[PDB]
Design a binder for this molecule. Structure first.
Ligand SMILES: CCCC(=O)SCCNC(=O)CCNC(=O)[C@H](O)C(C)(C)COP(=O)(O)OP(=O)(O)OC[C@H]1O[C@@H](n2cnc3c(N)ncnc32)[C@H](O)[C@@H]1OP(=O)(O)O
Ligand SMILES: [Cl-]
Ligand SMILES: [Zn+2]
Ligand SMILES: [Zn+2]
Ligand SMILES: [Zn+2]
Ligand SMILES: [Zn+2]
Length: 551
């Protein structure tokens, strides 16, 4: 419907092209079509298969060859990427190109918005981290087979001879692709069904399941005084639980007491609950299970929960956590214990000044809740994610700093100190002090949680020592003590005569949220990043559809 008259486009876009032209000397290399012979570059057309330059763009613009402004934008970016492709990162033309692109980004965005568009930005997804069958860096050369087995240029030539082994089968090095990790997937567009304008799907938050009749831009809606049909796939409409309700009430009551300007309501939902078992690993099993001194496995309930806030009228998932709950039927040493498998956040909560406080309220609430059920003890491993890894949310904002261990430890201490002052937590200790207090003598007495540090270090210890599970145990606990919190919820004689633990909430099947892996995999496979407010809002919207529809 919306026809851009060629003069309309010329008038609107030519100032953005002039802005590039008037950059001296940066513009000069881009003002005329590359003549490879004259320029003393014969191999230019071996690399650059779609040449483009300012004159060609000016001409297409003057002669009405563009039907819509994104076609202009694509040519501009083709020109830039042609130069970034052919020239070295350290070269003259490369840096000139970079300068022009910065001028262009600043010029183009408000123009595109004047023409009725979401924005004028060129948007691409973050590059995935490539492992090594070690990790491969952005833009640096690497070797791959079936887009499945990749090797960094160093550890590839490390391999002696001409044959690699995958799995087992043997592959000649000549069968590997040599390539640079410089591939970035563009963001997708959706077309307004009325005016025909192409908009970033993430800018407009159009999801085909939620609005199956098709996308209609805000411009077109406002002209006829319409509004979008309600999004029924919201965080609020996910099923309530006793736990979720309790946590969200605690949070919102806290926010209401603070009365900070521009506070929003928080929604907390439990989205997974299932019964699982942790199996004792082979070292510890040979040592204690086979002689009947320790259970071969421990049953627990896993739960996944998320907190959401409305930001700019749209749901935003900002906090996530998975927990392991070992009930009263579980064998010692795990009986009546909870362990935090992992928690994660995306730092867009508003207001900023209460973000940490809100995370603390969620954790204190959770401790309070399980205490009420009759869980006696909480367990926290203060372990930051490894470099460029994510616990729950794929692709964090690059400006969200990741705490190192000391900061993270102090953060848990501040939470627990508040919990103590509220008389929820009786006390807490590091693992070494706790073991001392419990007169622990053997490794079989240490709580054994899925994915935790202690099961792994005990395997290593038994093997290193040639059969002892407990020789250096106090020394290992002392050495790592600052990182391991044991939290006493129910203290002393009362902890010995408790009734059975009965959880009033039902099980909640949801394979997507059975541990962290499935949601990380989904997010990676569908470009669901949490790396900016807009991408997190999209990713939240998609997550919520998935949670509503898989149920
Ligand atoms: C077995 C695992 C069990 C667990 O899951 S233990 C927790 C492991 N999970 C993670 O670390 C997930 C990634 N981290 C997060 O989502 C968050 O950092 C977390 C843990 C929820 C806490 O968030 P926040 O309450 O916002 O506290 P914070 O320490 O992250 O940030 C508060 C202020 O400290 C700053 N900060 C954090 N790391 C820093 C650094 N490395 N260098 C310098 N500054 C740093 C941060 O920028 C912030 O400053 P500001 O007050 O906003 O100016
Ligand atoms: Cl999607
Ligand atoms: Zn946009
Ligand atoms: Zn490598
Ligand atoms: Zn429209
Ligand atoms: Zn404030």
């Amino acid at each position: 419907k919306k026809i851009f008259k060629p003069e309309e486009l010329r008038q609107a876009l030519m100032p953005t092209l002039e802005a590039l032209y008037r950059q001296d000397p940066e513009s000069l290399p881009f003002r005329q079509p590359v003549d490879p012979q004259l320029l003393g570059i014969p191999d230019y057309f071996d690399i650059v298969k779609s040449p483009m330059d300012l004159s060609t763009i000016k001409r297409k613009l003057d002669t009405g060859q563009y039907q819509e402004p994104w076609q202009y934008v694509d040519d501009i970016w083709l020109m830039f990427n042609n130069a970034w492709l052919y020239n070295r990162k350290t070269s003259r033309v490369y840096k000139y190109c970079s300068k022009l692109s910065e001028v262009f980004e600043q010029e183009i965005d408000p123009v595109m918005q004047s023409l009725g568009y979401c924005c004028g930005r060129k948007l691409e997804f973050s590059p995935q981290t490539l492992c090594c069958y070690c990790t491969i860096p952005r833009d640096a050369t690497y070797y791959s087979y079936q887009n499945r087995y990749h090797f960094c240029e160093k550890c590839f030539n490390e391999i002696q001879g001409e044959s690699v082994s995958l799995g087992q089968t043997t592959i000649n090095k000549e069968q590997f692709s040599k390539r640079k990790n410089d591939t970035l997937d563009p963001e997708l567009f959706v077309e307004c069904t009325e005016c025909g304008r192409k908009m970033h799907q993430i800018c407009v938050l159009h999801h085909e399941i939620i609005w199956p009749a098709g996308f209609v831009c805000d411009g077109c809606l406002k002209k006829s005084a319409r509004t979008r049909k309600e999004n029924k796939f919201s965080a609020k409409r996910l099923p309530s639980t006793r736990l979720g309700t309790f946590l969200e009430n605690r949070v919102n009551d806290f926010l209401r007491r603070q009365n900070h300007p521009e506070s929003g309501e928080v929604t907390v939902r439990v989205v997974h609950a299932s019964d699982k078992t942790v199996e004792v690993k082979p070292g510890m099993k040979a040592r204690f299970v086979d002689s009947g001194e320790m259970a071969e496995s421990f049953p627990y309930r896993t739960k996944a929960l998320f907190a959401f806030e409305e930001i700019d009228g749209v749901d935003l998932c900002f906090f996530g956590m998975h927990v392991q709950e070992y009930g009263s039927d579980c064998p010692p040493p795990n009986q009546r214990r909870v362990y935090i498998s992992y928690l994660d956040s995306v730092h867009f909560f508003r207001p900023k000044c209460l973000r940490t406080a809100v995370y603390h309220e969620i954790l204190i609430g959770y401790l309070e809740y399980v205490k009420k059920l009759g869980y006696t003890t909480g367990h926290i491993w203060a372990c930051p994610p490894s470099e460029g890894d994510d616990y729950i949310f794929h692709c964090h904002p690059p400006d969200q700093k990741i705490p190192k261990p000391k900061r993270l430890q102090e953060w848990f201490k501040k939470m627990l100190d508040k919990a103590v002052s509220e008389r929820i937590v009786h006390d807490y200790k590091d693992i070494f002090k706790q073991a001392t207090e419990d007169r622990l003598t053997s490794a079989k007495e240490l709580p054994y949680f899925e994915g935790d540090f202690w099961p792994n270090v005990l395997e290593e210890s038994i093997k290193e020592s040639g059969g002892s599970g407990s020789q250096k145990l106090y020394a290992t606990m002392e050495k790592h003590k600052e990182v391991f919190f044991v939290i006493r919820l129910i203290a002393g004689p009362a902890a010995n005569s408790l009734p059975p633990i009965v959880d009033p909430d039902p099980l909640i099947p949801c394979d997507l949220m059975d541990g962290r892996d499935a949601f990380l995999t989904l997010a990676r496979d569908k470009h669901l990043e949490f790396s900016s407010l807009r991408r997190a809002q999209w990713s939240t919207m998609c997550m919520l559809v998935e949670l509503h529809t898989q149920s």
